From a paper:
In plant cells, ALMTs are key plasma and vacuolar membrane-localized anion channels regulating plant responses to the environment. Among the different ion transporters and ion channels localized in the vacuolar membrane, the ion channels of the aluminum-activated malate transporter (ALMT) family play a key role for the transport of chloride and malate during stomata opening/closure. ALMTs are also involved in transporting various anion including chloride, nitrate, fumarate, tartrate, citrate, and malate. Here we report the cryo-EM structures of ALMT9 from Arabidopsis thaliana (AtALMT9), a malate-activated vacuolar anion channel, in plugged and unplugged lipid-bound states.
AtALMT1 shows aluminum-induced activation within minutes and mediates voltage-dependent malate efflux conferring aluminum tolerance. Addition of a detergent LMNG may have introduced artifacts in protein purification. Notably, the purification of GmALMT12/QUAC1 whose structure has fenestration employed LMNG for purification. To check whether lateral fenestrations are artifacts from our purification protocol, we determined the cryo-EM structure of AtALMT1 with the same purification method as with our AtALMT9. AtALMT1 of the clade 1 possesses no fenestration, and the conserved threonine residues apparently stabilize the selectivity filter. T61 directly interacts with R80; T84, T144, and W57 (W120 of AtALMT9) make a hydrophilic pocket for positioning of R165.
Numbering used by the authors:
A (entry chain A), B (entry chain B): 1 to 218, 225 to 402
The structure:
Amino acid sequence: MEKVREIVREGIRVGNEDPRRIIHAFKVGLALVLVSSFYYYQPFGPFTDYFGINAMWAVMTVVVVFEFSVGATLGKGLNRGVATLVAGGLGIGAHQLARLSGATVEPILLVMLVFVQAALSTFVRFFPWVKTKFDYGILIFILTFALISLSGFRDEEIMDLAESRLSTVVIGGVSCILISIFVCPVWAGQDLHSLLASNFDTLSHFLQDFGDEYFEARVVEKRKKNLERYKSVLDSKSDEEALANYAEWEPPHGQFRFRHPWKQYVAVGALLRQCAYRIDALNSYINSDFQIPVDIKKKLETPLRRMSSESGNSMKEMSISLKQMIKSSSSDIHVSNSQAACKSLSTLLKSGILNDVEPLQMISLMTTVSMLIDIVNLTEKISESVHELASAARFK
Amino acid sequence: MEKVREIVREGIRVGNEDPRRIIHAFKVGLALVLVSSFYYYQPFGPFTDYFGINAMWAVMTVVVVFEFSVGATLGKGLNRGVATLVAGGLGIGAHQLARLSGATVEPILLVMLVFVQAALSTFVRFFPWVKTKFDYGILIFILTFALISLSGFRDEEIMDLAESRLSTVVIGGVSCILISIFVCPVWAGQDLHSLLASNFDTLSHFLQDFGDEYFEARVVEKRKKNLERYKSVLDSKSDEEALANYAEWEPPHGQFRFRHPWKQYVAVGALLRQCAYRIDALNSYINSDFQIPVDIKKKLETPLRRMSSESGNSMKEMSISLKQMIKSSSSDIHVSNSQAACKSLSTLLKSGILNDVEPLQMISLMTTVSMLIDIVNLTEKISESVHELASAARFK
């Protein structure tokens, strides 16, 4: 009973997390019905179905080449398609060779060829260039070759077997691709933009709410969760890569172009990760119980404040532009003011106001100043990268 | 020609990277031959092969359930096994129901059941609890149910079809598992230990060679590559998870136990990542062209040096123990001396020797002192975690 309730509760949590995870089941269902309706009503004239396995093969390929995205269906489909053709060709030919050899060695020779081919192909699987986008093609190549070359049938029906396998595969793939590109689609590149924009906004929110915590200007658990929310940015390496890879087979679905540079998206993601690198260091200083007396804080309050405010506005403005997919240069004035703020702080440091203080408490105050200066420089670099990701791609 | 040479050159690079990537192809080959030799010589009496697809199914399942590890074959095998049984059972039964209904609705009713079942199963696929280790079971469940319930055969041969499918699957899985656990095996947990030990050693090497660079005690590209080698530690999140998941199906292969706590391995990996977090910050200070005059460096040389030396020895000693799989407490004396070093530095800071210096160059020197103190504290925490990962598991 309690286990049943826990299972049910996860249902609403997953369903309400994303409304598109409950409409994809109906799509899988409509697939497995449309394909299984063509055969029964056998249109476009009659067929052969010599081995009586057309229905099984058509149904099977529709379940394994239908994935959540629309950039993981074309790719899987194209692999399952080509591989079979090539493997079949090489197969039907091989059977001719063994016939000439005779009637006793013929089975032994066939085994040797399939052994060598399987070993060579599965060694290629370990390469770092065919593993990112071609891990399925090699697997189907081994599968199709071994099935056709060692089916156990007679030599006067191998051509029909090869034709039947190819026909079922292409029929299933065509139906699966059409559905997922007509009735309520889900694109994969469009899930890389929003992810990048959310990362920008999350960092901005933390930066815009730093002066209150650091200067003690002020429930506690709720505010802690709001502050400590940068973990996502630091824990999204394995996901920004995949979605980028999955988004190279997409067609030009409207505004997005054929050659959209997703490589720059990963580069900008790394730069945002570097900003979050130092942010985690800064946050640990605040969380720590040890503290320095608040009185000193006012002495250098003015310079530190300016940095936090201008930094946050720059990030937020960029996420706004990157989202609406329109280029802008509003962040230039904000980063310029931040550079002016650092120069003013340096001029203030000439006066040496920070003298006559305890060196032990000085170490903590000094480290904070260090982190802020890097974030001002790091933001400047990120500004250049974004100012070009919106130029190589058409952001009109 | 040039493309051919590039392809060939990658061959030696991949082959010499790991000698075990060239012996796994022969294993795949021996598999696809042994299975295909049983049928031809039909031992243990004769069989039926009513539909003439036993050879195809046996060959097919051997190519898709053979993976590089030995913790990704049992798992895949067990899934492909159970799923079919359960799905078949539910299938043969469903056919009985439709018969009672009549002879016209019978096909329409069957389609409705398979539609509902497919939609429900593929929604479960999106859960975060059945995706880490059970993403294959659901897929085979949909596959087997849809094939049996919609094969298109007569009602007097469905039982034989279900029996044939189950028999081929179990035969292929048994052969594939036996090979990969008898002739030259490759374990997956054993590839998590060495990875953790290598991470420990890499961090130690950087820490043990910090005083020379920071104090200018001293080709350049070679030394830069030796220093800047911490990227691996920071870029191994997506791999320490997988290998851990793949290593829950392993049997007690000798010293390793049935319930080895790989969760603690991931926790120690996160702690090492936190040490590498701050290490990258420290390295960027060195790389930067801007510098502070070397003269001041000697003033506080003694405290900083001690920290680097003792820190490195502690890491190295641990990797030695963790590798030979024997517990030790040699790192206790090293971290204790580091704590003594920090107290001595604090006592030196009482005297305020660092006065009468330029505040602008002071910021850089001060930040370095900050980073070192955290690494001394962070190392202490890691010592506690390691001192228990070797206790929950049997490290005798």
